[PDB]
Amino acid sequence: KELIAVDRYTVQSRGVLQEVDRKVLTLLYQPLIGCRALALYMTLWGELELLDGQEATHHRLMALMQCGLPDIYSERLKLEGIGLLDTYVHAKEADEPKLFLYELRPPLAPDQFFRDEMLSVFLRRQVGRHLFIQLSNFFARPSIDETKFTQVTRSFSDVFSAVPAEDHIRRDEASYVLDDGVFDFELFFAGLSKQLVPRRAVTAKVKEAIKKLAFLYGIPPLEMQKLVLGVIDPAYHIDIDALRRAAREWYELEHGGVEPRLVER
Amino acid sequence: ELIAVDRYTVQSRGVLQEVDRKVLTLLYQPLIGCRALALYMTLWGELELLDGQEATHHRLMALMQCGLPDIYSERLKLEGIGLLDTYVHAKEADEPKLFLYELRPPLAPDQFFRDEMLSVFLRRQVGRHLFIQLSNFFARPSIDETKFTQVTRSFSDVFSAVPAEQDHIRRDEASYVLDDGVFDFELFFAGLSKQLVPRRAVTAKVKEAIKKLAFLYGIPPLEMQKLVLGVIDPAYHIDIDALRRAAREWYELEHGGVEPRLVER
Amino acid sequence: HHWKELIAVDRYTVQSRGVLQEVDRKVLTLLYQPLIGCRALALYMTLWGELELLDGQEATHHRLMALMQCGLPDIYSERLKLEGIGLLDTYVHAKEADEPKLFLYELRPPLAPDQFFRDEMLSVFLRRQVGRHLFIQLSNFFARPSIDETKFTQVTRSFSDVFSAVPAEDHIRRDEASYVLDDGVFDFELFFAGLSKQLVPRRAVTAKVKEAIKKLAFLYGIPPLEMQKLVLGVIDPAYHIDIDALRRAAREWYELEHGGVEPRLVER
């Protein structure tokens, strides 16, 4: 009654499902949710591609996995519980049947999983010490010795210019560094900081924000004082969204919206 | 500088997967060029080919069938745009240098398009039409929260802790959740503040970590109330780790090293 | 001289009947790249990416120039390396009227590492261009320890062992799964007795046909006298048996026998 074979569903994911997760599904989540749940997750992953947003009835699921509906439901719940599945329901019209949305959520990364208190303990219980060790090493790579090693990596500003023309496995998000001397803040704060819009108001995130449009759009600090002071409210809101448009309109005052080009130095 | 006799290791703290290849080919390549795309792919191949081992730069020269100076030039764009971090080892005795080529995965698509700089450069190099196509490609439909309830079950809903004996494609950190009724917070707080430890010292980071430790280790609020006060930073904050470290020790002395086990409910 | 054939306003499409997978990407980077060079590798990557991005659609080579940040001469030079080495098939649309041309770029997957090393030319080229030490590391990387038959014996079940049909109401290589059926699913002794009486040379039933007969008999429950008929209905004056035609005859026979209900797979 919570689920009827004639109820309808669609499978979506606002993220992608890849091969590093496949392994963490089979080797990490498996021990916790059991093997029938793994199949339920793999088939959903399949249905994702097999219907692009198209709608289906649960008979298809039953047919794809050669299983009866009750089993499917019990394992679904497990997938939900452990965070692999968000399940939504459409506003019910009229005299039934239901419409479902299955949002697929990729597993944790290996580092996040072992750093979770419960999941990591629960796992050691189910698999046993020896195996739990082998599993951890499998998802780990040798660490970097920062004693022997100095980072000489060049920055974004050393390689490029903007000119107008006519321990465990984890995903470390790549952040190019925009150095500092590309933009001077004390000079930016010369005719500014006395405004009682103080060093306090501007974040460290907004610091790097403006730093970017400076490089991108070729802004001298004197000019962006007037862009900041233009878009900031009496409430002392610093909004990234508007400040962008200030900078783009600014850039359109002369270069006509050609947009800058990335070039090497 | 960089000479052919110099040595290198290729390492990564992450794994490099299919949407990465598509992001790197369709998003990064228009900025850094193909010649650079080639080097990125080659280093990533080396990662697996040389398992932690050492190599003369003649290898790269041979595998790419390219000359050394070009290799240097393109590597700098990799370093520049944050696809590569390069470290060096200090020199003894007399020559040659040893390099650590650290590979970083690209941004996720949602991130790349949100970078205040990268998205702009791309649209210039690519042209407006192809840019929209690149955006739509890495996009999925957004979920309409107006028509859709979330009926998803929690972790505590489907599992229990029991003792034993001895639009843009993005990366979800997928968090299982624990219903707050798995712990009595009222009692914890109304017996607490008397030490001048506020409800301002409990972050959701702490608030959530309590829930887990409670659930996993079967800790009553009054005992947790004791642990909290134990390692609390004189600064009026809390270190989650130390708190965990306390309960790991607490569970021991109370139950005799007998471990938690995960079960269906 | 690329302008003699390719100009910027010429149009392309990218297609494949294959899917290019991770493994291919390593073979491309480690095996093919030393031979064809780094630039050709990027064009191949770009073409593979284009396969998904353009979805069956047209583009002008301007787009490729923009994606890779290079010019036509280079793209063209490398395109041809991909062609000669087997990585790309190129087709041209029959020209009407005159300008601009329409190219079909048909992507091909690399060889499997076993095929690559077992190739007369590619292996010796690769050794020379990469050196002896690196060559062995590549070979090993693409190899997996063999199976010792002396000490190991095959207990695998066949299809017929595990299933029944009922009416309803060394180098990395690609060894595809070949299920097998026990020759006991069908009585060939009787079957061939029938054919010999009808002057059908035993030679007519090839391994491929015998294999086909087996599957048909098992799937449809066809007795030997009845496959004698089916075979005799589809057989050449040359004594050749067309398996496609036999399959149809079998599919038809089943529709008469059980009334178009189709066979169902079940455990035994």
Added chain:
Amino acid sequence: ELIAVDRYTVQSRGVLQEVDRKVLTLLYQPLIGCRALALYMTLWGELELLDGQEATHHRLMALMQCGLPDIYSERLKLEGIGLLDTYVHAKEADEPKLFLYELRPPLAPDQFFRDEMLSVFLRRQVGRHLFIQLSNFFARPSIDETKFTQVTRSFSDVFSAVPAEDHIRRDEASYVLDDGVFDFELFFAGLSKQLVPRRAVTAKVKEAIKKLAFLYGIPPLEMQKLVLGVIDPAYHIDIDALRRAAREWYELEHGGVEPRLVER
């Protein structure tokens, strides 16, 4: 017949890949059932995790969170449908048995649908409507040969040897040596004079000759002796033998220099 303390090892000569997964999920799974899919998946995980190592079946039971009887029966389905080959070690002394689980990748989509039984079973299983979506999913639009003509270039067009100091399938990329690179008439002229049947040169041999001729710059009359050198009394030509003769011949001619691949 299978007990928990029996040992296994997981091995493969292939590498199971992303497409392979979809086929297993959308084409095999309706035949073998979900549980067999998960055992297959698990075995693919173990292949990487135990690097050639040994385990007791306890590990299987623990990873899959399941008992031995089911593991057994689902294993049999994998064997029957062709996804798994099972070997045993001869038993010394007595108990436990050592198994080799050898993983075999799924049929590619074209081979699956072309198969008599699999397509007919899958069809009845999923219903005619879904069977079509499944067909289409594994399909790519064909190449119209009426409107398109191949301009592809061969190996010899692009490269040279020199001495130095529709259903988805696998179309194995076969580079083409357009055979003007070697005069076969000259080769067979004198070879027939030496009374070697033309039947002796199979396709495989002919291919090998062409490739060795181009790679080592071997003239027709020299290939003639080389082949005569390696042909046995049964008129079989061993390619590997012939490769050796051709390499040696190149060494003796150019002084152990090796061939290099270069633009033409």
